[PDB]
Amino acid sequence: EQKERKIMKLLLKIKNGTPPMRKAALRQITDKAREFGAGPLFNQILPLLMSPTLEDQERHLLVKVIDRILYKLDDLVRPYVHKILVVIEPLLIDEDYYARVEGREIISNLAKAAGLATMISTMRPDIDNMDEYVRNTTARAFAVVASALGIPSLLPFLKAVCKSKKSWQARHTGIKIVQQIAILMGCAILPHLRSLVEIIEHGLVDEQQKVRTISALAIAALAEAATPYGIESFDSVLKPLWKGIRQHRGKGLAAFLKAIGYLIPLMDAEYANYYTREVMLILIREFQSPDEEMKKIVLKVVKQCCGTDGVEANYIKTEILPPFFKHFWQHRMALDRRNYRQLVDTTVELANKVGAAEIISRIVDDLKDEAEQYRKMVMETIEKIMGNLGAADIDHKLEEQLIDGILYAFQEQTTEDSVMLNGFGTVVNALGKRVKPYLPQICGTVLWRLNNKSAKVRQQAADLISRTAVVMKTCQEEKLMGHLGVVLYEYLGEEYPEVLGSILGALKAIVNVIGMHKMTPPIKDLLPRLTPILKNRHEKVQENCIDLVGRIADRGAEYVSAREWMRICFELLELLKAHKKAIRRATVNTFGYIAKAIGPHDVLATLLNNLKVQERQNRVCTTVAIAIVAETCSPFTVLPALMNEYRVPELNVQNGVLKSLSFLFEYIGEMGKDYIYAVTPLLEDALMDRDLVHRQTASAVVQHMSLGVYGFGCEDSLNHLLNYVWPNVFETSPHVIQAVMGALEGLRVAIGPCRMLQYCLQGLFHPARKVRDVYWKIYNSIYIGSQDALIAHYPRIYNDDKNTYIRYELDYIL
Amino acid sequence: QLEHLQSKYIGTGHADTTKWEWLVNQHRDSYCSYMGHFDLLNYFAIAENESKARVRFNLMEKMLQPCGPPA
Amino acid sequence: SQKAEVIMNYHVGETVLSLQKTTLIPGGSESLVYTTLSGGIGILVPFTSHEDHDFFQHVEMHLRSEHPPLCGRDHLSFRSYYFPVKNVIDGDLCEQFNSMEPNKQKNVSEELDRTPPEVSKKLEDIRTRYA
Amino acid sequence: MFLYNLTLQRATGISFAIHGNFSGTKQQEIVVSRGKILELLRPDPNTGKVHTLLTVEVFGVIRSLMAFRLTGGTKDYIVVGSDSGRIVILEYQPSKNMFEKIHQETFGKSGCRRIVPGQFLAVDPKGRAVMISAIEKQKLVYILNRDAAARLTISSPLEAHKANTLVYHVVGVDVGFENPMFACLEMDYEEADNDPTGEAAANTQQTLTFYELDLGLNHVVRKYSEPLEEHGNFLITVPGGSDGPSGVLICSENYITYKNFGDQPDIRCPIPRRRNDLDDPERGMIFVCSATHKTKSMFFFLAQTEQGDIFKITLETDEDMVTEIRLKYFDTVPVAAAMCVLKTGFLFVASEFGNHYLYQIAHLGDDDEEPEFSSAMPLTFFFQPRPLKNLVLVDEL
Amino acid sequence: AKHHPDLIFCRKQAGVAIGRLCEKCDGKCVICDSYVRPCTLVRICDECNYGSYQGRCVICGGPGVSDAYYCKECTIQEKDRDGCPKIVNLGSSKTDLFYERKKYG
RNA sequence: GCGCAUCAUCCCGCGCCACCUG
RNA sequence: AAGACGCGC
Ligand SMILES: [Zn+2]
Ligand SMILES: [Zn+2]
Ligand SMILES: [Zn+2]
């Protein structure tokens, strides 16, 4: 009927149309859902999710509106909990991070809003379902719902399910639930570890292969969730696991090995060492297994065993390194992804534990292999080892072999990846002074890679130069660095944008490593060459050139004429519409250095004229620029211009200058106590009931000044400012409420809680309700912070004939 | 919607909190501050010919139900 | 009607039951000697010059920023316990400046463009003049 | 209009006291805390004189102070709880002659707040954990451990909050290499404010709550809740383990109660009174301070009453069961806020007001001419005060 | 955080570990989003730092490259003596942004 | 449906949270 | 081209 006839229109409005229309439609959906109900609304919403042709955007919007309407409704979704659950199950079973996060949030909201009894009633029957996908999604649902509202409320229920005898399916489901709780909760199951261990023990004893495998997985999950402590609660599981290790084979063997490897770090050093010695024979017997999953499992087990302190370097080297290294270095197993990452992690952990010497000395030869994946793997291991351990263990032979290997690897640059550059940079940084003889070779190779076939490999060459400039400068080869700089200077005419950005980054690095006065290119000609680069449109070149000219202004401002200073300021104003925030921050920094170098008159006049762009993106940037100019220059030479610009009746100009005053007061801090008197008439004018934005800006200025001048005795003007700020509490807009609350908090921390208590005591018991509510919230805000002074600031209340309200202990006289 | 810190604090009033709760909270805070401050406790123990232990014991007993019984 | 205004505020930390303004050392100057309920006796010394006041304020601020109290309590917050501090300079940090290791005291000495010996001389000048 | 603040005389009154080997040597030292000044002073056994060795100001209000040491170590650390919402562990360096901070962990807002920890502090006797508690609704537990570098380490705080409860005193309980145990005089008041009939004062008894510390599970749980016949004041830590049985003594009005977890029967013993009391009989008698002496041969407890009578408390017990508590009158001294019994036959008394004395114990008075009392005697007790006989005054501050 | 009221903090007991910030949030304050006067470090809670969550940005959730800090104003306002200042929500803007990017990308 | 205005709000092109699979 | 908020013809 009419209730349903108003549903599809809103659905088509929110699914089709401009964003304003769908936002408004969502607004009256949220507003009118109190009278709409839940029954027909869900009866119409759910078939939309049941549509096979559902899209990502439609599903996301519908789940969001369902989440909001369910948050609004406390206990009005009880009859449809089962439907919501069974329709969210496909949403959460998906392999999308955002989708599964939204699904788990939905189920948590279901658990919080709805009672446990109805959930149990609609929840029990599907535990013993024959289909496996529904069992998996129901296991995820149990995990999230037990995460909500706490696990102990349903822990005995889980024990009862796991103690089932009718079929092994119920025990499998219960062990899956325990594993899911272990994998999701993390550290929230530590107090309840013993009961879960006892529950999983008898399932482990069970003869069913699936049941014992899932029990081993649950034990491993519990161990990894209780990694720091919990061996005392796990010492009763070791014997069946050892029996399975010594008897079972196949997938069960893999699960038991994973469980024991997870449990090994839990115990002490001696027990872990003995168990690693026991399992090393089986590990060696299993290394050459064709299965990739088992190889990954044994790699993880080996890494965990090696991470423990029970083993020793000599023993591990003489037992496990030769066979593992012989059977775990092949291209066929290197072609994988999970095997790739697991092998990298295992090798780097082993190198950290036992040492890097041999583990790099007998892989530098393999670095020469023509395979690109093998080269990438060995270089990743090398760079991880260099970053983690260090490089103070290399002799001449190993270091020259490593240099030859890295040079050969970089020479055969076939794939497109930055890992090449990262590895080379880490290697050269780790080597330090010991690589100084070889620098001409790298210089020649990088030059040869630079000058060929029209700027394609020049990107990585310039990135490499920028990365290695530090060691290049510390190698005392100043003439070579100057030669590279000047050559790259005439190589500035490249049309390619990414190549130009790499060139700009390399120029930044070379001018940063060495002093600017020693740079061979002409700066007086460099700036006119960089100005067209400033007029470029690509983001990378724009940010690089803006930071470069910021460095120019910071250091090399003496050799730059004021005419081109003003011009590049003009294109800085023009460029302020950049999308990236880093570009805008660098731009306002450039204004700061320029105004520090030259008198803040022309730049200030140009900045003050950019407050009429009809877009707040440029206005805030100009505000920050004006604030930084006033901070880096004399404040008393900027304020009169700010007031003169305020004199115009332009609302945008007034808002900009007020924000500039707020930012300046925030930046200067305690030094600005002398300028408090100069801005009092402006604050009084802004605090007048004319514009909400004016009141917000005035409150922000008051709060910033109060925080800045706190502790220096400036209460005379602060009290007068509060006298006008206070009548702004009665507002409805959230932004002005937040600004007023911040201003009053600053005035409280500056003046003291006594005056705030005096003001808030006027209407704490007012006959009306809204004034009482706002006074109570203000009083709570005051009472939360600096409570120890209100006791002295409390007033005196006369006691009644039935209760005592007078503290007689304070009336004692000595 | 940052009211979590408001609700997670004990000793502050709200919309329909009566006078009795406010006064008993004030008395409890005053007693706790008296106990914390050594100088005021010493002043109290000097005013009456007693000991600091007895004064703090009596102050602890006064924390059971200040301002008479609830109405 | 007419209301007076407070021009100075401080928090000694202990109850004060004595307050007098009389000279202590012959040939000295008037000081505001006070005695507290905890058994401590202190005096208040006015500043005879603006340069000395600026130097003392800079020293106090630098010590507060560089040398925190042992129990991890904010010195400014401790002094502004019940009411904000007003026109009072704490000398406890200035006297404790003589107890730190040489590195930090020398570092703050060039940071103030001064030298530790004359700094200690200036610190002891007030003590030997007003007490 | 600018004044300079100076301090001609430092604070002298003593609010807390503690003793230990703070220099790593066999020489005992005393660390007492003033109102806002922390200073170290030690006596000379050869001459009996006391000289201050270090004096610093902390710019804060000290609410608790006690010392501890790690097992197998030789140096004692200093833990102080100030009005700031953080805990700091100190260490004394004899070479630098100054206190060196070792750790600093923040857990709440600053100031003497009702629900901010810092008022009550407890340390495990073995020296493996420290507990800090608030007046109401807040309790925190920390784990003390030594890494491979022989440096102090601090773990994360533990959640031990209980809503709508009041805590009177917190003190550690010896377990003898078992999990650390903490006992407090926790009591509830939720029903007190919900009864308009005025019966809040009546039918409301204290409880002796016990808290474990499970290292394996890294969590704290309440152990028991035993109602008490009458309100208590403070607890005493009985040296447990191999040297004596574990337990706690409860000090109340005209009575002392011994309690222990398990199947330990309660022991009660009335506090003896003077001969022909000139005070009002209706006034009760409580305890103001206590000390201990964990001698290897035999341990004993010292306590002081409101009027200053010193009672030597001797505990008689079987291998695992307590038999009786034997009280005995030692001497009479001025009322002291804190008392510490030093080694080598020296006793330090930090008087509540006036000068502080340093007596010297000469005769232990084991079964002297004065008869002793016991809990086995059916029904009060009366003793005749005598001048100073066991203690001999040597030096005073 | 400040700009978006939807994001909320876990507000749990502070631990011993130190939070991290990504390159984008290198200088932003964890509360008021300011780049002025970083004084004190930021402590993280045990729940917010476990396994995969280790070395993650406090504000957005990227890889951790720099240590977090508290600004001078936040320290003055006594706001750093509170619970864990880590956002547990994923943000409403991020979901819509990712969905539209996936659709038009 | 019009004209507006605020939050140094987003603008980053794909990311990776225990997993698929005989 | 996007997350929220408030303003009247
Ligand atoms: Zn980030
Ligand atoms: Zn957290
Ligand atoms: Zn901040």
DSSP letter string, A68-104: HHHHH-SSS-GGGHHHHHHHHHHHHHSS-HHHHHHHH
In angstroms, the separation between the Cα of residue A233 and the nearest Cα of chain D is 8
Q: Which residues of D touch B53 (CB under 8 A)?
A: 233, 286-289
Is the sign of the CA dihedral A167, A168, A174, A180 positive or negative? negative
Nearest to A191 among D112, D215, D217 (CB): D217
Structure tokens at A431: 């080597």
- Angle at the Cα of A338 (from A333 to A343), degrees rounded to 5? 60
Structure tokens at A340: 């790739």
Q: How many CB atoms lie within 10 A of CB E64?
A: 19
- Angle at the Cα of A753 (from A747 to A756), degrees rounded to 5? 65
Q: How far is the CA of A203 from the C1' of F16 (A)?
A: 34
Nucleotide nearest to E34 (CA to C1'): F8
Query: Binding residue per annotation — E39?
Result: no
| Three-class SS state of A265 | helix
CA distance D209 to A569: 73
CA distance A180 to A801: 62
- Angle at the Cα of A449 (from A443 to A450), degrees rounded to 5? 85
Contact D43, D68 (CB under 8 A): no
Cβ of residue B54 closer than 8 Å to a chain D Cβ:
yes
Q: Backbone breaks in chain D (C–N > 2.5 Å) follow which residues?
A: 379
Tell me the ligand closest to E61's alpha carbon.
1
Contact A392, A356 (CB under 8 A): no
Cβ of residue B58 closer than 8 Å to a chain D Cβ:
no
Q: How far is the CA of E42 from the C1' of F14 (A)?
A: 31
Nearest to D85 among E16, E46, E81 (CB): E81
Q: How far is the CA of A184 from the C1' of F17 (A)?
A: 10
CA distance A758 to A811: 22
Contact D226, D250 (CB under 8 A): no
Q: Does at least one atom of strand G sit less than 7 Å from the CB of E93?
A: yes
Please name the residue whose C-alpha is nearest to the C1' of nucleotide F9: E3
Q: Does at least one atom of strand F sit less than 7 Å from the CB of A693?
A: yes
Q: Does at least one atom of strand F sit less than 7 Å from the CB of A217?
A: yes
Cross-strand bridge partners of residue D322: D317
Residue among A579, A599, A595, A654 at smallest CA distance from A628: A595
Residue among A289, A324, A327 at smallest CA distance from A306: A324
Q: How far is the CA of D106 from the C1' of F19 (A)?
A: 40
Q: What are phi and psi of E32, to 5 degrees?
A: -100, 0
CA distance A182 to A223: 8
Residues with CB under 5 A from ligand 2 (ion): E 10, 12, 45, 48, 84, 86
In angstroms, the separation between the Cα of residue D99 and the nearest Cα of chain E is 23
Contact D339, D309 (CB under 8 A): no
Residue among A809, C83, D85, C42 at smallest CA distance from B41: A809
Q: Does at least one atom of strand G sit less than 7 Å from the CB of A734?
A: yes
CA distance A546 to A542: 6
Residue among D283, D340, D346, D334 at smallest CA distance from D305: D334
Determine, for residues E95 and A60 on separate chains, whether the beta-carbon distance falls below 8 Å.
yes
Residues in chain D: 397
| Three-class SS state of A351 | helix
CA distance D24 to D344: 17
Residues 82-121 of A with CB under 7 A from strand F: 95-98, 100
Task: Tell me the HSE value of A292 on the side-chain side, using a 13 A CA sphere.
Answer: 13
Q: How many CB atoms lie within 10 A of CB D241?
A: 14
Burial class from Cβ neighbours inside 10 Å (0-12, 13-18, 19+) for residue D278 reads exposed
Q: What are phi and psi of A637, to 5 degrees?
A: -95, 0
Contact A85, A124 (CB under 8 A): no
Q: How many CB atoms lie within 10 A of CB A629?
A: 23
Q: Backbone breaks in chain A (C–N > 2.5 Å) follow which residues?
A: none
Q: A520 C-alpha to center of ligand 2: Å?
A: 53
Q: How many CB atoms lie within 10 A of CB A538?
A: 14
A698-727: burial string, b at 16+ Cβ within 10 Å, e else: bbbbbbbbbbbbbbebbbebbeebbebbbe
How far from the centroid of its chain's Cα atoms is residue A367's Cα?
A: 35
Resolution (angstroms) stands at 3.6
Q: E16 C-alpha to center of ligand 2: Å?
A: 12
How far from the centroid of its chain's Cα atoms is residue D74's Cα?
A: 22
Return the H-helix or E-strand segment holding D153.
strand D152-154
Structure tokens at A372: 């690109």
D165-173 and D152-154 strand pairing:
unpaired
Chains touching chain E at 3 or more Cβ pairs under 8 angstroms? A, B, D
Q: Which of residues 81-100 of D touch A (CB under 8 A)?
A: 83
Nearest chain E residue (CA) to A189: E47
Tell me the ligand closest to E30's alpha carbon.
3
Please name the residue whose C-alpha is nearest to the C1' of nucleotide F15: A97
Nearest chain E residue (CA) to A59: E99
How far from the centroid of its chain's Cα atoms is residue A736's Cα?
A: 29
In angstroms, the separation between the Cα of residue C15 and the nearest Cα of chain B is 6
Task: Please tell me what DSSP assigns to residue D219.
Answer: B
Number of H helices, E strands in chain B: 4, 0
Q: Protein contacts on strand F: list nucleotides below 7 Å from a Cβ.
A: 1, 5-22
Q: Does at least one atom of strand G sit less than 7 Å from the CB of A23?
A: yes
Amino acid in the structure at residue A580: K
Q: Which residues of B touch A802 (CB under 8 A)?
A: 68, 71
Residue linked to tokens 């008296």? B34
Q: Inter-axis angle of helices A97-113 and A56-72, to 10 degrees? A: 20
Residue linked to tokens 């809204």? A770
Q: Where are the domains of chain E?
A: 8-88
| Three-class SS state of D168 | strand
Q: E61 C-alpha to center of ligand 1: Å?
A: 6
Q: Does at least one atom of strand G sit less than 7 Å from the CB of A32?
A: no
Contact D81, D118 (CB under 8 A): yes
Q: Does at least one atom of strand G sit less than 7 Å from the CB of E89?
A: no
Please name the residue whose C-alpha is nearest to the C1' of nucleotide F18: A183
CA distance C100 to D96: 10
Q: B8 C-alpha to center of ligand 2: Å?
A: 16
Nearest to B52 among D114, D201, D352 (CB): D352
Cβ of residue D49 closer than 8 Å to a chain A Cβ:
no
Please name the residue whose C-alpha is nearest to the C1' of nucleotide F1: A21
Determine, for residues A715 and C84 on separate chains, whether the beta-carbon distance falls below 8 Å.
yes
Cβ contacts of D255 within 8 Å, gap of 6 or more: D230, D268, D269, D270, D271
Q: Does at least one atom of strand F sit less than 7 Å from the CB of A584?
A: yes
End-to-end distance of chain B based on CA atoms, in angstroms? Answer: 34
Cβ of residue C38 closer than 8 Å to a chain D Cβ:
yes
How far from the centroid of its chain's Cα atoms is residue A801's Cα?
A: 61
